[PDB]
Amino acid sequence: DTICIGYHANNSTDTVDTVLEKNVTVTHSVNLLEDSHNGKLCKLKGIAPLQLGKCNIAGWLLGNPECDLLLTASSWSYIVETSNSENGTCYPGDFIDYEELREQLSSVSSFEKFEIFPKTSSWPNHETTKGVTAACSYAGASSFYRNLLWLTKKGSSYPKLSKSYVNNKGKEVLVLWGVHHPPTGTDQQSLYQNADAYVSVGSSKYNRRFTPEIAARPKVRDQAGRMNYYWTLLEPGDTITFEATGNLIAPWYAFALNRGSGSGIITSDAPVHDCNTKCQTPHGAINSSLPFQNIHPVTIGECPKYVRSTKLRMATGLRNIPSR
Amino acid sequence: DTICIGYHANNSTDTVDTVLEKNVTVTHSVNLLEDSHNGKLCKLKGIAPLQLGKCNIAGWLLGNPECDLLLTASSWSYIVETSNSENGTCYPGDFIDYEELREQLSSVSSFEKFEIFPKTSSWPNHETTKGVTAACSYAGASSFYRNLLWLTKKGSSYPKLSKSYVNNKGKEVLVLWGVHHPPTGTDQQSLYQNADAYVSVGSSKYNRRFTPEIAARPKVRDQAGRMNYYWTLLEPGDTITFEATGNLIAPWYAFALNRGSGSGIITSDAPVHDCNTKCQTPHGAINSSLPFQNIHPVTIGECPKYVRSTKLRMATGLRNIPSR
Amino acid sequence: DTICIGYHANNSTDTVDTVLEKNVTVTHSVNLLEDSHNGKLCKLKGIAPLQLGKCNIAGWLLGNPECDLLLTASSWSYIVETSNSENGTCYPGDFIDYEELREQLSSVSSFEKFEIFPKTSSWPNHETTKGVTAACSYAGASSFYRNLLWLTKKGSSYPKLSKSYVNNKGKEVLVLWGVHHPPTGTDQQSLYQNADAYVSVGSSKYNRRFTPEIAARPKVRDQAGRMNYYWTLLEPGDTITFEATGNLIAPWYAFALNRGSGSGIITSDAPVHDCNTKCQTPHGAINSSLPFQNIHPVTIGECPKYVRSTKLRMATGLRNIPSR
Amino acid sequence: GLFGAIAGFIEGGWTGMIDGWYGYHHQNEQGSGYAADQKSTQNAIDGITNKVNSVIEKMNTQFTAVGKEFNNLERRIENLNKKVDDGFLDIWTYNAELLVLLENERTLDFHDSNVRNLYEKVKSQLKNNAKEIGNGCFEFYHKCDDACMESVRNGTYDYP
Amino acid sequence: GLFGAIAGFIEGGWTGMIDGWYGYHHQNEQGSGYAADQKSTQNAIDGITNKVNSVIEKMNTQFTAVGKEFNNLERRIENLNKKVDDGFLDIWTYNAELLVLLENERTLDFHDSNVRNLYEKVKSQLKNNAKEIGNGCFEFYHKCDDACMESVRNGTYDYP
Amino acid sequence: GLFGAIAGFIEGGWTGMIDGWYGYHHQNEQGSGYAADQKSTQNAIDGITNKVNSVIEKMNTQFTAVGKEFNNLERRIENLNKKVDDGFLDIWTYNAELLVLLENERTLDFHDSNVRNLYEKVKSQLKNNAKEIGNGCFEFYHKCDDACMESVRNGTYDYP
Numbered sequence A, B, C: 001d002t003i004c005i006g007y008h009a010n011n012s013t014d015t016v017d018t019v020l021e022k023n024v025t026v027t028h029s030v031n032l033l034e035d036s037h038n039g040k041l042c043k044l045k046g047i048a049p050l051q052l053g054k055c056n057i058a059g060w061l062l063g064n065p066e067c068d069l070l071l072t073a074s075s076w077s078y079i080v081e082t083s084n085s086e087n088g089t090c091y092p093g094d095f096i097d098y099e100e101l102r103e104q105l106s107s108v109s110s111f112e113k114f115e116i117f118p119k120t121s122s123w124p125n126h127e128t129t130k131g132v133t134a135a136c137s138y139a140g141a142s143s144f145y146r147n148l149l150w151l152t153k154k155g156s157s158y159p160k161l162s163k164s165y166v167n168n169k170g171k172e173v174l175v176l177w178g179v180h181h182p183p184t185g186t187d188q189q190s191l192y193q194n195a196d197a198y199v200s201v202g203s204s205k206y207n208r209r210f211t212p213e214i215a216a217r218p219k220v221r222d223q224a225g226r227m228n229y230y231w232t233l234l235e236p237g238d239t240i241t242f243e244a245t246g247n248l249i250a251p252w253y254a255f256a257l258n259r260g261s262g263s264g265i266i267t268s269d270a271p272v273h274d275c276n277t278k279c280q281t282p283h284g285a286i287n288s289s290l291p292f293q294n295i296h297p298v299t300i301g302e303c304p305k306y307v308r309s310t311k312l313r314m315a316t317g318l319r320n321i322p323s324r
Numbered sequence D, E, F: 001g002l003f004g005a006i007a008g009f010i011e012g013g014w015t016g017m018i019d020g021w022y023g024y025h026h027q028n029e030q031g032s033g034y035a036a037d038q039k040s041t042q043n044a045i046d047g048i049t050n051k052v053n054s055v056i057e058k059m060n061t062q063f064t065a066v067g068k069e070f071n072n073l074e075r076r077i078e079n080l081n082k083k084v085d086d087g088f089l090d091i092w093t094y095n096a097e098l099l100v101l102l103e104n105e106r107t108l109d110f111h112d113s114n115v116r117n118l119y120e121k122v123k124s125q126l127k128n129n130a131k132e133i134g135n136g137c138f139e140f141y142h143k144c145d146d147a148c149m150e151s152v153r154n155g156t157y158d159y160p
Ligand SMILES: CC(=O)N[C@H]1[C@H](O[C@@H]2[C@@H](O)[C@H](O)O[C@H](CO)[C@@H]2O)O[C@H](CO)[C@@H](OC2O[C@H](CO[C@]3(C(=O)O)C[C@H](O)[C@@H](NC(C)=O)[C@H]([C@H](O)[C@H](O)CO)O3)[C@H](O)[C@H](O)[C@H]2O)[C@@H]1O
Pocket: B130, B131, B132, B133, B134, B135, B142, B152, B181, B182, B183, B187, B190, B191, B219, B222, B223, B224, B225, B226
């Protein structure tokens, strides 16, 4: 009569690496490495990403004439841009502190576009039409940005303008505007009359002055002039005051804001879906509760630590010796 | 008769976590995690922190009329600000590269405040009085910054000023000044006469020019004008030269310096004491020699690694089995 | 009759530290810590470093009169500067975005210096000679930068200049120039005539305007004037257009570029040699395949992790008890 | 392994035994049979489980955050960001890779330990009533039935 | 534990023994008594002490340094800083938490090993002069006094 | 050590034995002699080799990269850089230092294990044909020649 001591074996083919030995077959194991993605750009924290289509942050903010559809947003957890997202600053020029703005707007709660300085109303004594260009062309015809107004002279006369706005929104107001720098002193006159103009913007925490930088430069989109865009965040209760004698690409539309904690922008061609996720990568969402992933270093959300491993399989069972 | 092998047990109730088992009672243990603070803002490396009371770095540097008591410093290891530290830039305006200056001054050795351009002496041909304002008000009355002099015109006449200083201190000299930007061209005249003024500051490594940015803006502290403050570190032996025709908020007092290695500012309401410490957190000093602390991520000094753990108890004794 | 079980011992005196015991003699071991350097600045990735001799990046780019020998480069993996590398900006002034340029140029593939705006040819209507200075003196005599041309007035007459260049190089073109700021309005006339001058540079992605900042300042290298240098990278196909009425220190030579991935600059007095290495430190190359080095934190290449250890010896054999 | 039991003096495993990780065979006059040792198998499972939860639960889950965007004049900061990200990458890879390796070695040794301790727990119960054969087998001198077998695997046996 | 001695074949500990960690009971005709094994207890202490000093001493103490301050147009750098700080936080937390867990398991197994090695060092000294009972007890065949008891715990004994 | 064999019940090593790490002495009527146990010595070397390759190979080699250069108005970024570099330094030093320490303890214990397992593999082969003396020595009752010696160190022996 006998009795034997012994251990479990099975049909398992799982392998784990140990410190003394590579590739050991074990009866049971768990994976510690996430290496599969979702294929889709998912909702982050209940909310969906802002999609911009063929426009980039600049074009959508400025109101490039190609972004007439995505005039649709209300609150987003992060922003998506695609390979086909080049409609932005159509009139050549520099967008000041652009990366910063892009960073700030990356998540937002209550977001209203509104009419700050109404076109046919706010600017008497000035020429509100004819402020269009072939650079910013719509349906073949020359047009302009939908959110900005290109104020030009009215019968050879540009009287110093002093328009002001008070923030009764109870939230931040993002105000953009631009300053036009003509190519030569000749256009400076046919456009804004006053040979020596200036644009001045002032609020509580913002005081900058701008001045016409007239010069000869190559044509970008068949334009020798340039247009610099500027923004600022007006605090609830504050007043912003535009005072100019020419070169002012005035606000027409502004935005009301509750800025988000701290998200980011992701650039991907993956399809957005109605699904949820705590970790978002450029190629797709990562259903992740495991400590490590090897799908992508850039990420948004509560994400496993990115790692360059291929295999992080951790033994739970014992050495599997079925002895066939 | 009989001999037995066996192990120690005792009345200990210390528990440590092991990898296979949570909460194991052991006969002895040591703590690796510092989780207690001092309650007090202590000395760092023998030296005490600079306290500013109700003023912040700007107000104390500029000589805000409310910082007449803390005119008391000589050498500090770091700076402390409190919840009740709002007296700073009283005349509205921008302090240029302010965070950088705050960073530079965070520790200092030999620190003298001195009279660089004496008030009743340096500025003949100009009006040194009447350079006061309700914004920077003292004891009800309108006053000004103690370290800066608001030079105004003298009988409708502001003659180009050219005052210069040589650094015979054998240490760096921190020089601040401001430029005043009136609200309208009307005040520019009643104040500085010359309609087209400029302020120019020049040294060996510093050449900037400033120009009056006249515009309409909201009133901050019942002021439509603005005042931008600028600083610079003058090297031993160097010369700084102020040349202006208006808008100059000239230096009256400057500082002499030996900058510190590299500290920082801590914002706390905890009381400063005469005690010593190698690690300082916002809530209190951390008497620390252990490798980890869970008291605060922001810190100054030779500090344990901040960690999110609650318990890092390391077993030294054996599994405690009194089986009583 | 007996058989015995037992273990190897030998004449080894290798010692490793274990967690329970310091300094244990073992029969065999390996080193994990690289603590020896090469003594020489070696080739990085097959290619050699750019050496500048007594000049720094600025002097070599601008064409300081002392850098007439190192007019020798073609492609480099990183740049080396030495203790004796002070010839740079000889005419006092600020080099804009200097650290950034230094960073960009740290590695380069196809690098040609060429004559963008030929001296005796491009500037008729202007005075191309006499644009020299004692500050940038050569062989005792007053001279100037080799790559920049100091355009002065021609018989009391400085006609608005409009010189432009097109990039047919099929690579980036680094263009430098300067703007001269005279010490007083008196020199502004004897030099550039037009009392109110301006320099304007324009391309597709570059539109800045510069203006004469006339002021009184200390003499640096016996010069009260200052000269700010500016650069830009012109993209293949683009056009850059210089338009000025004075104060222009025009381009004479420019550079053609293929910028490198991302290297850096190392400052060392060690001798460059024809040897190869994957890891470069300031004191010498590090022949390294081991995971850790304790030679220098700053480094360039595929380098072991810098560590503050003295000894990282890993036991491979057993405890060596020779019992001699 | 470290305790020389699994793939050691007990050369192979039992696909037959399926109620647990360690256990007894036994051949009686009333039949052969496998039975798992419930006590040690559970103890082991609670341990391995805790082990796995430590390695997964202890990770301080990131809390949103990307990488950043810089223009053509911010190369130095761009690269600093890259250095940071690549820095974390090398550290997480190395530590992840080695952690798993150590944990694995430890785990297999753990099981080796549990088998050995079970063998020695039986050995020191039977004493001179059984003969140590090998491969973890004891052969009884007193020929014992399914009732006694259960006392042995149950820890009661008794009869030095 | 891993060596199956502590909470193993020796089921419990002794609050009675207070001069050290491991030791001997002993019941003689001249009385019962506890004595610590000084040799192993000291070796253990030196080891555990060294173990603690490594974990504490090896930390490259920071050397002053805070976090930084950024304005409203420096959000990207601000967040880079945050990424850095949070990055170090996640790494230190994970490594701290796991290190202590491994060290602990190792430490308890260390003690388990020391007990077992002490038992076996006595066993192979008494040989066939004592009977292995259990719970770490040997019962002598030759009835030995306090002088002999001290030879055993002293390592001299002698009489295969 | 942890298995009490090396510097344990086998007090010292053999400078004599030079073909491997573990092995047999043996004193026969036809002479004394050392022989390495090839099987275990190789197994050990493959293990220790793998151990070393893990610790060296798993390091995700950096891929070019320096430190950076900042002007006098970039002190905050300069210090951020420094915080990053110093941060990685403290982490790498601590983890390097402790890794080697753990690995080393493990390695020596590994060897201690291999010696003990070899002893016990011989012990349970000779059974009652030899006498356990000590220091890892068995003394035969049946006086066996160089042919039998080779059967023992070869694992065949046979004769419970
Ligand atoms: C230069 C000046 O004093 N302007 C004030 C102006 O005074 C006018 C004269 O300029 C004018 O020709 O003649 C009339 C009388 O017929 C007045 O004297 O008056 C307006 C309207 O009341 C005033 O506006 C406002 O003033 C407030 C601030 O006043 C002070 C201050 O307290 O800070 C007075 C102080 O004396 C003065 N400082 C110096 C040095 O002369 C400053 C200074 O003018 C500003 O700081 C410049 O920006 O002003 C406040 O602005 C209030 O909201 C507003 O109604 C003009 O300031």
